[PDB]
């Protein structure tokens, strides 16, 4: 009985808190896993700049969530009543009637006739998936965005176990985070090596050249630059585009027409992951200084990943010694990491730059 008041309280606090993350991921899975439609299409480049206006500041997200969640809702219940509207023989025929719009266009835009294709289940998924969408903003608002933002406005031994666990997991990722970025983002721009990604390699290798300092700048510049070639890619695989021998222009620089009926969440998954990576990154740095804001800890304390321990402490137990290890194990063995480095990147080469890698 107390317990599960207790649990219906906490699990609501805990939902009012998350469900941000719940609206975005069901958000691009309306605006990602159904057609190239130009609604679609803002559908996900709004969420893609609600994304980049977290990363630049937690403070101006948050302050303009609420016209933010008002214009998304009020978009997607006017595209919603004007898609149910052309789905019709007689309204669809009175539109090409007056608006006089070519069929290609009115395709592209993404009001086309279901009923002529036939194809009923990806209408029922047309119809749900957007007012799935609406049901879930209208229950992020009234009834969470009060309770997020009071939050956001700053088995005992098992519960005490998790805490430590998540504080220590979440010290882990806030010291490593823009690593773990920076390595999915280059493993994916390694498994594309087309010519439409060369300002981002640039740009990463810049941040990554001066990263902490002067804030994390180079990463919303980054994120704008996933966020433009996302786009891109929708618009080149919407139909209203027009388009030594073995390559020809798209495929080079990489922004390609796929082949129709592929859904666009296939071929830019990778995109879509590092947007994701990026705003986790983000969401890691802000929910971090939140909590030693609240706790009074100063940004000195970011530095280490146990505070509590300092190196010297290592050789009383085998868990002190993986804490030091975990803390500044780089930063007693930077040289010989760096030319195990060096000596993998080697054996993966043999080439000139392996020559002068090795000089």
Known sequence: SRKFAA???????????????????????????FAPNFYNILFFALWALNLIYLKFSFRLYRGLAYAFWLTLTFYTSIV????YIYQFPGVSQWIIRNTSLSQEWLNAIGLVDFRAIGESGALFLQLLAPIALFVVTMLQLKFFHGPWSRATSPVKKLHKLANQTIELLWRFFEVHISKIVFVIIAIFIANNINALYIPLVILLSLAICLPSAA??????FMCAYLFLVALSKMIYQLDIVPEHGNISMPEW?????????????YMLFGVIVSIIALAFQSIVIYRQRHYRASLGLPESMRAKVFPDFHHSHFDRSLKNAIQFLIDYGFYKFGLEITMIAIGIDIFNRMDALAAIQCF
């Open 215 to 220: 804030d994390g700048i180079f990463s919303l």
């Open 7 to 33: 649990f219906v309280e906490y699990l609501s606090n805990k939902v009012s808190v998350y469900f941000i993350f719940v609206v975005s991921v069901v958000l691009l899975v309306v605006s990602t896993c």
């Open 253 to 265: 620089f990489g922004l390609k027409k796929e082949v129709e009926g592929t859904e666009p969440i």
């Open 80 to 83: 919603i009543i004007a898609l």
